[model samples]
Target: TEDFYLRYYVGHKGKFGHEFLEFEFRPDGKLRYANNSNYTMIRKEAFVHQSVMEELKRIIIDSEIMQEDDLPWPPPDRVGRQELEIVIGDEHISFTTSKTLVDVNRSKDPEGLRCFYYLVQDLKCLVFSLIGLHFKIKPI
Candidate 1:
């Protein structure tokens, strides 16, 4: 199986305009989360279970991301939001608020958007759990 990668960003423009959280899952079993503004590494784990990687790949393929078009270009009017970008092999998929809404009528494949939503949530949980574990074992 080929290595898979997923990167996501969440942020908004305003008081904390430059603030954002970035999560990157690499093929080498490394998961990294950081604050984009200061480029601070919040947490990183050298080993992520193979099962997690496998599941991510499955979700990507099952979602038909490669065949789908990019998320809405203009990006619908919104405030305080998160956007997702997925890369596998040579393909890329972007999921944004505007994209999801446009997909409903454009692609007629809302399920793909739903899949991405769950993917982001799942990744969040995984990263948080690792953070908890890391803190519990570190020197006090």
Candidate 2:
């Protein structure tokens, strides 16, 4: 049993509809992985350096594409990386961490863990096709 829960959300829209990819993990001393309603299970040992959050940020910031063009990496399709690598196979998806975001300071609080909270929220909307689990998408 753990005292905390870790959440991951990615934003995306498909022909069927929007879907939010959320994964919950036991954030106690030891890492424990579990499946959500969608059946997406992730590693309990979540590292900020090798986290999906960091990957998300890298894609959003590093990619030379302009905002007017392709927004988020269309599908979860493999995007090229300089150091880190992500492999998606028919049976499993794997992430390899080559570097950590040591210089990037996305958090205002000194003690706040670099969870990339803002990116996570944005991804929740993007991956889920603009639909958030707890928050309603406002009319633009």
Candidate 3:
């Protein structure tokens, strides 16, 4: 299961300022979180209960978005960028959206990014509870 992992990034702003969370979850229980929100920078790499990884996999799989690549491509919103990437054994999958689109998952949700949010929020709590950190991320 070492080959399975998830990485995510989101947000906008840079140059004068930057705000985003880049986080990764792996099957081995290793987790990565780097966030620079409101100009407050924090970066941490640690591990949570190994079972956490299995639970993450379950959440994503249950959402059935692993094949999200088959849905529509990421929207054309310009507010900001958000993306998700996953690798499972011989299969690798990626899906991207925008903070604008995600504003709605907050779009159809249950039909949108609820799971991805679940992944981010769920993993974040584990890291904070186990390691006392504040950060999360994704990709575009």
C-alpha lDDT of all candidate models, in order: 0.61, 0.30, 0.65
Tens digit of per-residue lDDT, candidate 3, span 84-104: 788776778877676644455
lDDT of 1 by residue, 58-106 (tens): 7667756556543433353345456777777776666665422554445
Best-performing candidate as measured by lDDT = 3
Tens digit per residue, CA lDDT, model 2, 1-140: 11223344343344544433334323232222222333233223333323544444355454321122111212233321111111222222222111123332432331222223333454444434322222333212
Runs off by more than 4 Å, candidate 1: 35-45, 62-78, 98-113, 136-140
Higher TM-score: candidate 1 or 2?
Answer: 1
Give the TM-score of each candidate: 0.60, 0.21, 0.69
Query: In model 3, which regions exceed 4 Å deviation?
Result: 101-140
What is the Cα-based lDDT of residue 88 in candidate 3? 72
Q: Could you tell me which 10 consecutive residues in candidate 1 have the lowest summed lDDT?
A: 69-78
Residue 60 lDDT, candidate 3, scale 0-100? 63
Per candidate, the number of residue pairs that clash is 0, 8, 12
